Amino acid sequence: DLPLDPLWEFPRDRLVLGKPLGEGCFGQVVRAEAFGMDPARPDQASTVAVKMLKDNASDKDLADLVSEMEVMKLIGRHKNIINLLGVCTQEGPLYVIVECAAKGNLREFLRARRPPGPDLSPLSFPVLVSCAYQVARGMQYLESRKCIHRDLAARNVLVTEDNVMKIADFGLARLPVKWMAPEALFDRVYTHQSDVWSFGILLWEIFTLGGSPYPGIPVEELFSLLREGHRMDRPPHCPPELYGLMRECWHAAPSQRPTFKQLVEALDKVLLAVSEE
Numbered sequence: 282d283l284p285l286d287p288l289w290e291f292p293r294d295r296l297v298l299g300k301p302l303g304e305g306c307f308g309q310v311v312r313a314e315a316f317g318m319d320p321a322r323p324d325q326a327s328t329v330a331v332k333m334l335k336d337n338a339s340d341k342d343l344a345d346l347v348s349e350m351e352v353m354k355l356i357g358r359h360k361n362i363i364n365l366l367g368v369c370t371q372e373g374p375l376y377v378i379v380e381c382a383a384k385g386n387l388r389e390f391l392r393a394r395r396p397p398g399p400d401l402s403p404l405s406f407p408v409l410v411s412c413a414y415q416v417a418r419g420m421q422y423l424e425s426r427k428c429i430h431r432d433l434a435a436r437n438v439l440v441t442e443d444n445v446m447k448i449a450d451f452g453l454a455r456l457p458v459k460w461m462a463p464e465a466l467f468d469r470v471y472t473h474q475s476d477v478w479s480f481g482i483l484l485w486e487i488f489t490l491g492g493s494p495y496p497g498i499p500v501e502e503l504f505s506l507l508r509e510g511h512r513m514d515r516p517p518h519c520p521p522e523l524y525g526l527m528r529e530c531w532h533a534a535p536s537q538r539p540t541f542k543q544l545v546e547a548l549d550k551v552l553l554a555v556s557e558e
């Protein structure tokens with residue numbers, strides 16, 4: 282069984298499950314409608330997402346879902362992360378209610394909003410910087426809460442109906458080798474500074490509108506190329522100020538990379554200037 286948390290327990294009868302959003306190995310995320318999620322308007326319907334176990338799940342999977350739920354409570358609320366909204370622990374399967382991100386992941390959001398490409402030739406430049414800045418803010422918050430993400434990439438950044446960026450799967454208990462810092466790749470060392478390296482890759486994904494990192498380069502060849510000091514080229518139409526930030530994230534020495542605080546500060550300076558360009 283699971284203890285009743287007066288701060289988070291939501292009534293099971295006020296939650297209506299909908300179509301699945303995605304299925305993992307033993308877990309899944311589904312659409313849902315919640316009634317009275319905001320206590321100020323207790324009859325209002327709101328669209329949410331529900332993390333739950335699949336039928337093939339074991340007690341190890343249940344402990345992993347419980348762990349993510351508890352980590353989400355400990356970390357607390359931020360505008361730029363997928364927030365916990367409530368829980369259904371009593372008289373039925375465990376439901377972890379979280380914020381809905383109607384527009385899906387950032388990579389597909391950007392790919393669907395691309396201008397005519399090189400085989401032929403919507404999102405303004407300030408909106409793109411705002412996306413980067415929002416993700417930097419969310420990461421700054423997670424870091425302040427002792428949370429190392431380990432898998433920061435555009436596929437793990439979700440977009441709401443209101444176009445707010447929300448980092449997902451921060452509470453979790455082929456490998457994404459192209460986003461990994463070299464000390465993480467080679468020495469299995471994951472710090473806040475290795476998340477800064479991934480943020481640099483994410484910045485490149487933003488300014489290529491969902492481009493695949495290291496275009497052409499075989500995965501096997503990546504490691505040797507990084508060891509030689511090679512890094513990705515400046516995306517087309519990307520300003521040198523933003524490419525400069527990417528290159529700082531990609532410094533070999535973790536201590537030579539910027540902090541999330543400096544990234545938030547540098548991205549806010551660009552955003553405020555570019556908003557009147």
Ligand SMILES: *C(=O)c1nc2c(cc1CN1CCN(C)CC1=O)CCCN2C(=O)Nc1cc(NCCOC)c(C#N)cn1
Pocket residue numbers: 302303304309310311312313328329330363379380381382383384385386439449450
């Ligand atoms: C949220 O309930 C929601 N999410 C996604 C879609 C639709 C909806 C709800 N919804 C709003 C718009 N109207 C017209 C109908 C409707 O049903 C559409 C597809 C993309 N959604 C999505 O990605 N949601 C989402 C995903 C999450 N995880 C990403 C990995 O999924 C396995 C999370 C989380 N955590 C939260 N929302």
